[PDB]
Write a protein that binds this DNA or RNA. Sequence first.
DNA 1: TCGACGGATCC
DNA 2: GCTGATGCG
DNA 3: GGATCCGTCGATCGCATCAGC
Length: 276
Amino acid sequence: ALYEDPPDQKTSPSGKPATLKICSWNVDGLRAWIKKKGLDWVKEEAPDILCLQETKCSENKLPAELQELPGLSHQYWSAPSDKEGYSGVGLLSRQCPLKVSYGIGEEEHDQEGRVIVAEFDSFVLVTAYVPNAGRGLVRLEYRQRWDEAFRKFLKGLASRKPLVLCGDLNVAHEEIDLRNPKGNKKNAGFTPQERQGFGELLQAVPLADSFRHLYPNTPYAYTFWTYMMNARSKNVGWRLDYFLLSHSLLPALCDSKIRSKALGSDHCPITLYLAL
DNA sequence: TCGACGGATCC
DNA sequence: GCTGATGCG
DNA sequence: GGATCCGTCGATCGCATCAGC
Ligand SMILES: [Ca+2]
């Protein structure tokens, strides 16, 4: 059926109020997103950090609009080495980061403008747009190598600070994260492989799926629908966009939300509340 | 995601 | 700037 | 032999490039 995201639990497990609001969103064309009034929604939601994926836009072609955009003064972008109009991500922050890193530190996996690291005082934040296993699973082979590297770099990372990873992970973890599971079991995004990966990643690093940590059994809660075949109309979507918390931060987690009613892409923005 | 094709297999 | 076509997802 | 089963396998909607002029 349809999903109604619950109201915002702005208090910790321990009564301490939320201090830190990170928002994440696969934009799918940053210029079209802004033309489609997405930045309005950003302004009204007033996050402390905004992460975007699928920006499909190069550094200089970046629009003027997000220059004026206040409260998200520090802005960082990666966009692929040699392929224009493709991929790209960006991280905007109200407060200034301690240190910003691009890519995951392997050549093979750092050429498509997918990953921004940003270390803050008490945590480190990664935003990524995981590569699609490709239609016809033509790039499935690659993405098993991506996953294994993303893992071993995310594990190294968490070893030092506690981390929040957000972004589009291109994996529909379980059959509850998919409107049509059985008609998708070797479509990309729900292969035995990619769900296998997600599982390794949660057990490897380790990381909790914050949405499923608070709503382990809510169905029909989705983050993406194809513009085709009326997919968002019937909410026949997926859950592709996660907030993957280190276990240290589980006592800081106040809520984890999915802002379905927010138009402008084929994805909807998600939103994390922590007490930090 | 959807519907058209298949080629089966069923009462 | 404009038309076509192709890429990606 | 006709009506239902379940595996394929074809155009859709959107964003952005590219070639060419
Ligand atoms: Ca292609």
